[PDB]
Structure 1
Amino acid sequence: HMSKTLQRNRKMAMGRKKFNMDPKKGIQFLVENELLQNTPEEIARFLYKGEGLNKTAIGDYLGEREELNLAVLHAFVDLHEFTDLNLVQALRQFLWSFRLPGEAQKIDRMMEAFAQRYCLCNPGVFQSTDTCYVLSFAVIMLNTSLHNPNVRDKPGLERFVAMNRGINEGGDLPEELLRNLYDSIRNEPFKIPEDD
């Protein structure tokens, strides 16, 4: 009843603080105190809700190499609903849900999982998941090029189109697809979580 519930609520709050200090210790405390079930899906749902969790700490946890963390990463990406979204719309959602700069192997795992999910959700768009992966990074790079004033550039649509030749199973992506992505980034930069 009430005392048990009040204690649990505070211990949940403490668990979130512990998570932000060190994700593994945070999850351990929650699991050991029966505040979170120790399944990949339940941990993923906990991270997806992200209540009081630092997005850098979420990315940290999702980027760990061990089996359970890989499984949580898979389940976390599965919670994302990309059906009928274009690649940029999907990226906006995905990239807002966690942060993880300059960890190449970790980002590779995360973006491959994203690519697989996007293509599964939208089987008509990219016949090859490699196409999706490469184009995803092209969009991220385009965002930086167009909106970071440190970057000289401002590549035009025609350059963006040229940079992506031949990645559609040896063919090209429809120019209208590329234009739509380019224009979407041009008109609205990615909202990127700040360093928490």
Structure 2
Amino acid sequence: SKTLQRNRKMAMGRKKFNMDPKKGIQFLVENELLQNTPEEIARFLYKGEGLNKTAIGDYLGEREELNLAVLHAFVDLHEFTDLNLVQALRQFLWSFRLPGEAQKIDRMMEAFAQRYCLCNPGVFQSTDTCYVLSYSVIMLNTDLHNPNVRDKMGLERFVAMNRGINEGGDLPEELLRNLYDSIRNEPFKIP
């Protein structure tokens, strides 16, 4: 039944994606299984059926114009309402495997931050504050849980690091302490 063929060409579209995200999208587009718009590619990645999260992360981390548009659309598919920053980050970083290059993490955190702030207005005074703090949380996860780092950051150091990021002033110590404790006691889960 003209449909099982559709399943074969989809399963083929997803594996290729897992081997090479760009080629798998091209294959899916060419075989009319997926619309070549950033919005539809993003939905496809977000649903993530049968997709390796490392391949999703690698695609979202590219700098080409379409990939940037997809990342924007991908983050728009996340609902962060009534989540604290760490809970929102956990949900976000569950949907793809974060790349390790700082330029990619930076771009991903800024995009995350814009959305976080829209979903949770007035929690931060500016999206910049949310963006810088989110990045410092990624730094904190790395510091605390990567075994190549021997001299682990304590609370005091984490507090000192975020000095000045609230539009030249400070965030409250208890907000930073709660972030610190959440990451220390539960690293970001490996997808």
Q: TM-score, normalised by structure 2?
A: 0.91
Structure 2: distance between partners of 1:61 and 1:144:
22
Matches within 5 A, 1:5-154: 5-154=3-152
Corresponding pairs, count:
191
Aligned CA distance change for structure 1 residues 103 and 162 (closer, same or farther; 3 Å):
closer
Q: TM-score, normalised by structure 1?
A: 0.89
1:48-99 alpha-carbon deviations (Å, 9 max, x no partner): 1111112221122212323222111110000111111111111111122222
1:15-64 alpha-carbon deviations (Å, 9 max, x no partner): 00111122122112212222112222211011011111122211222123
Structure 2: distance between partners of 1:147 and 1:108:
19
Aligned CA distance change for structure 1 residues 105 and 189 (closer, same or farther; 3 Å):
closer
How far off its partner does 1:119 sit? 1.4
Aligned CA distance change for structure 1 residues 146 and 169 (closer, same or farther; 3 Å):
same
Structure 1: distance between partners of 2:176 and 2:123:
12
Q: Secondary structure at the match of 1:4?
A: coil
How far off its partner does 1:167 sit? 0.9
Q: Contact 2:79–2:119 at 8 Å: present in 1 too?
A: yes
Q: Contact 2:61–2:99 at 8 Å: present in 1 too?
A: no
Gaps of 5+ in 2: none
How far off its partner does 1:100 sit? 4.4
Gaps of 5+ in 1: none
Aligned CA distance change for structure 1 residues 154 and 108 (closer, same or farther; 3 Å):
closer
Aligned CA distance change for structure 1 residues 123 and 143 (closer, same or farther; 3 Å):
same
Deviates more, 1:87-96 or 1:149-158: 149-158
Q: Contact 2:141–2:183 at 8 Å: present in 1 too?
A: yes
Deviates more, 1:101-110 or 1:82-91: 101-110
Question: Percent identity, aligned pairs only?
Answer: 98
How far off its partner does 1:149 sit? 4.0
Aligned CA distance change for structure 1 residues 123 and 46 (closer, same or farther; 3 Å):
same
Structure 1: distance between partners of 2:122 and 2:15:
43
Deviates more, 1:63-72 or 1:168-177: 63-72
Structure 2: distance between partners of 1:106 and 1:182:
23
Structure 2: distance between partners of 1:100 and 1:185:
16
1:142-184 alpha-carbon deviations (Å, 9 max, x no partner): 2222233443333332221122111111211011211111111
Deviates more, 1:177-186 or 1:63-72: 63-72
Aligned CA distance change for structure 1 residues 105 and 161 (closer, same or farther; 3 Å):
closer
Structure 1: distance between partners of 2:98 and 2:89:
14
Q: Contact 2:58–2:99 at 8 Å: present in 1 too?
A: no
Structure 1: distance between partners of 2:122 and 2:141:
25
